[PDB]
Amino acid sequence: MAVIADPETAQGFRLAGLEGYGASSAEEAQSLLETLVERGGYALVAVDEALLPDPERAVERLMRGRDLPVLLPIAGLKEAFQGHDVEGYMRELVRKTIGFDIKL
Amino acid sequence: VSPTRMNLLQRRGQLRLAQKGVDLLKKKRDALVAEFFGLVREAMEARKALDQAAKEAYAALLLAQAFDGPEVVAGAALGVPPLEGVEAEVENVWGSKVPRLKATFPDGALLSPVGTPAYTLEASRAFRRYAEALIRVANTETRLKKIGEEIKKTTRRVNALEQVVIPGIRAQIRFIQQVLEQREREDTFRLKRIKGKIEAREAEEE
Amino acid sequence: PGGDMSEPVTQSTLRIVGAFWRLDASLAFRRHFPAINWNGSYSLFTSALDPWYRENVAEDYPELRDAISELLQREAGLQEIVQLVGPDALQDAERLVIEVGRIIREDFLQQNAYHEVDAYCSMKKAYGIMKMILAFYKEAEAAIKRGVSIDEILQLPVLERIGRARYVSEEEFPAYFEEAMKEIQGAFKALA
Amino acid sequence: PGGDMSEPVTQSTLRIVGAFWRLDASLAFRRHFPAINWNGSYSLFTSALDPWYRENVAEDYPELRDAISELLQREAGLQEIVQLVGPDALQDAERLVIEVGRIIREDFLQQNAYHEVDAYCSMKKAYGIMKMILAFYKEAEAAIKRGVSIDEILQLPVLERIGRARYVSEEEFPAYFEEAMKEIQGAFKALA
Amino acid sequence: PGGDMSEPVTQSTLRIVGAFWRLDASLAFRRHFPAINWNGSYSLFTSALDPWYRENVAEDYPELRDAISELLQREAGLQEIVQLVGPDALQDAERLVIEVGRIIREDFLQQNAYHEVDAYCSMKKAYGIMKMILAFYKEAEAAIKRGVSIDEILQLPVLERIGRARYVSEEEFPAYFEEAMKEIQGAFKALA
Amino acid sequence: NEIAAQIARQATVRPDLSGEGEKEEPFAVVFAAMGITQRELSYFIQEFERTGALSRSVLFLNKADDPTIERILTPRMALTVAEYLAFEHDYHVLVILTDMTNYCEALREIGAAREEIPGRRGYPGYMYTDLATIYERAGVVEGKKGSVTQIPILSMPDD
Amino acid sequence: DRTHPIPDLTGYITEGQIQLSRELHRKGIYPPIDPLPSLSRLMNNGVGKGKTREDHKQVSDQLYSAYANGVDIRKLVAIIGEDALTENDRRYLQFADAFERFFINQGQQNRSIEESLQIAWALLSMLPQGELKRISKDHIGKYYGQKLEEIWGAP
Amino acid sequence: DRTHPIPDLTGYITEGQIQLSRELHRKGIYPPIDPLPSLSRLMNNGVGKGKTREDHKQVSDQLYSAYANGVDIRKLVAIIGEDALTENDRRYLQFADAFERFFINQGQQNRSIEESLQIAWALLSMLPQGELKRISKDHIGKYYGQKLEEI
């Protein structure tokens, strides 16, 4: 599969049977993931939230008709120490998927 | 619609059907919402499990390339083959199909069962758990988003009903009612007029 | 006038006649005859005739007629859900009822008046046709109970026999019926 | 005939009367008495009656009444989400306004006609109860802004007290009101 | 009387006149004048006049007219769809149709009766305006086909040129029209 | 009106398909106009003289500026002539009655001037019998060759 | 049509109605009396202790609410399916079916009031105790738990 | 009912009408005058250069066309979510609500024509240029100055 992350971890994912790369620029990332999905030989991808928070504003325009390669955000090198805020992401997802701010 | 009595009764039937359909859709939405709030909790729990399992692989990869060899890891990564057994299972959730990841992902079947480096060995076992937890998060969040889509779809349908069809049918109904009342009033005025006219004429001939 | 069932003459008639056969403009536009609106019609003689039927047609005729009427009522009930959610959203336990409604409506009730063999229809013929329709229904329901998808049920080749039923002559019909019955049994026991 | 306010007699009546108290059946279904719906009802004598209130009850009575009315309006303008999601998943200020709407329509509007004390109420009793509820709502809002949760606030010992003001006699109400306002102020310092 | 077209005077007039210019209140509530409902109106003279247009306006005037009318008809059709699902739930072709429809009915059909210039409009002027609108439509369609999104189409500078075309006087309109064709061509040609 | 004129211009029997009869003599058009306007009348006359069918057509014109109560007689005169031609000189006749709505207007007017009991929307109570005395004057007769074919045209008021 | 002048004025003057239904009739149920739109306006004064058994009123109310719930759930299961319903909802479904098959469809029998209350309690027992929210606890302890026996083994 | 014979026949004789809305009354607005179904036929003879300020007629026109869009955008927001928007649909909802809450709901006070036009320009300013394609370019350069922070 694939992952658009810091290449320093991408080599670990290589060790994990999963090719990965990146160049710490949103533009080149969203440019060559176009090719990546046109070369859609993988079932899913991962991307750091920093390179882009939402991969849909990148790939949905080409992810029409297909749904197999699923895209989801993953934490990065910076967050690996400080940690992630699951609640921020979950709440910003539920707010749109149900139309209200919930669970306070 | 032509204004008659048959049409009026049909429009009333339609209005009753629409209301009894609105409440049914609302109940379907309530069940969907129960399922959704049941899913979101386990989804955030699986995300927390992924977060914690990230620290293990992170710790393994930091001191591996640092304390142990910096290039042995690159050599081994180029050595071990990648994964193409990542087939995905189809799943239907509330009348619609979603993918379900069922990546083969062998464990001992790959290269170097027990090998030379001390940290490159245990690290390779850590990205195993990393990938496993990640695909678990994938499988739960995809269904979560699907259920959310169905909920907003049902909401859109309910609002469409309750603010476009019901008022339109009420307006049609009242227009037909006015037409029918008007015609009845005209004909009774005409009857009274002819009755009085012939009665005046007969009182004239007595 | 204007097809209005609320005129005074139709109302005067409603309270006098013993049976009432209602024509509808929709089925008439579709060229689907006899175009008798099943929902609005009725008959008040169906009880006092049961002895004649049990003695002259078949011992269990009233029960078959009652089963068919209950099926049609259930289908008419489901139509109000279809009309707002669409036919492809129902559970297959319900698409079965809708499809059997369609089969009944277009293979039993609909009748050709100009065909030299479907113009007239005996009563034991109708008995046979009802019998095998509801036999197939019961079997296919038992099937869906075993995880059979609804679509392949709607492709079994015996449906063509059931559709051709009403064009068989009155003296050929018993052989056709005794063949179709075992064929319907086999269309499910053989798949196992 | 069947509850349609558009019929000629109701339309002719609504052009001359000054108040329209709307009894309702759904309210009586959930044991809310007297079943006057505060949403359809209306009155046209208030604007002319303000001075009698300002002189014979209090100088701020119209303001308290406007506050209670706006509070009920907010509460009712929120029923869609609470029916979609349920109360216990709302935010802080929304759950606060929901619970205050409940306190209102369960300790102020509701009245037991068979009880030997609540059957009748003065104007000053109503003014006192409204002032109590407004004080509590102000304190609860400030506290939730400060950092307390709602579950503590709904367990305050003064909720049962403000919910008991319906049943105190007219002679023993004024001192009751004074000490109750004292306690409402009191629990606040615990919230800060 | 009620704006109702089934009243006897209207129904008696519709049997003898050649054209029926129907006014609408909905168009007048949003200040769209002359507020004529182009869906309900018709004219039975339009065919006998073509030998006149072909010699006195332009040889291809009827083609322009028929294309404009067909565009209006399509946008009227699909706006019923867009009413329930919003404009984002439909593809780029329908978006272009909707935008060109808004352009047509806000830059061609409207006519300020109190403006010192717009109050009167010749035939050559109307031909030129229709020609501009159709030229832009064809170009934008080819463009959206070859990979430009809708936003850069809507942010073009030539739309302000087409929009103010009706305020240009008669004796100087031809030069404005030539320049406008230049710009409609050049805003897409420099746009690859 | 265009559909009616097109039918009149193109209509023909096909005896090579029935096999019987090989004559194919054209129709003789009887055309009755009640309350017709100048526009529609001009269209009809020009179409007929284009197709060359005036030499075998009878016309009873009652324009919209003619008196109203005349329209009580136009259909009956037209159908008298049609029946005569068909069942006496073996013609195949095609009758086109251009607007029955105007006939009903005239009927209602003369009926309400006389103060009867009116029917559904003021129209008289005998309108059914009155229209039947016009429509039922058509068909084919045993032992004769002629035929009378009717194509009434009416305008449903509010569709 | 319940707006025709005859039933309209009869509703003005009388105290309620018993609505017959075509659906129960065609489904083979007799007498096809439809409990949801029917209503007796003077019922409260003629039931209770000293007149009938003392549980009469609450039993009738619980039956009414449970039937309405079961009917709506039967409509919902067609689009959702019985595997996606809660347990209490499946109970309500089965209750509604047994209700319109045993309580309503009585045939040409002559039931007394005590047998009617027997059948009512046997039906209410299909639901879980604690869902019976209109009946008081004493009546529950006194009559709940009875099972359908006389209705299938006896006529 | 606007089609009842009384308001209907009265509509054909007068030179306009001021129609009151029950919705604005429910919202607490006063005077609950909803501007879409209202009309004043003789307006153009009384306003304009040398009678009122110069921008009167065009301000009215643009204000009307802008508020008319807000009503229908707010209508479709009531069916699909409020998520489906752009930068400008936010603008139009905000303008419509600020209109109903500041321009109409004036209370019992007496506003001159100058401060009325001032409020109107302050309410139009919360739309960008370019959308105000009903007014000309000159007095918008003149009057776009104040924003609604004056209350």
Tab-separated table of N, CA and C in Angstrom, chain H residues 76 84 94 124 140 151:
chain	number	residue	atom	x	y	z
H	76	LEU	N	-33.888	27.200	1.003
H	76	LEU	CA	-33.280	25.913	0.693
H	76	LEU	C	-32.401	25.425	1.833
H	84	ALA	N	-24.136	23.143	2.702
H	84	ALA	CA	-24.058	23.435	1.279
H	84	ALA	C	-24.167	24.939	1.077
H	94	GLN	N	-26.665	36.182	6.067
H	94	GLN	CA	-26.367	37.201	7.059
H	94	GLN	C	-27.062	38.509	6.725
H	124	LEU	N	-26.079	47.300	3.139
H	124	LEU	CA	-25.586	46.831	1.849
H	124	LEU	C	-24.081	46.649	1.863
H	140	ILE	N	-21.718	54.591	-5.124
H	140	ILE	CA	-21.243	53.544	-4.225
H	140	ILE	C	-19.832	53.859	-3.760
H	151	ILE	N	-25.007	51.368	15.780
H	151	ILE	CA	-26.319	50.792	16.044
H	151	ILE	C	-27.203	51.817	16.734
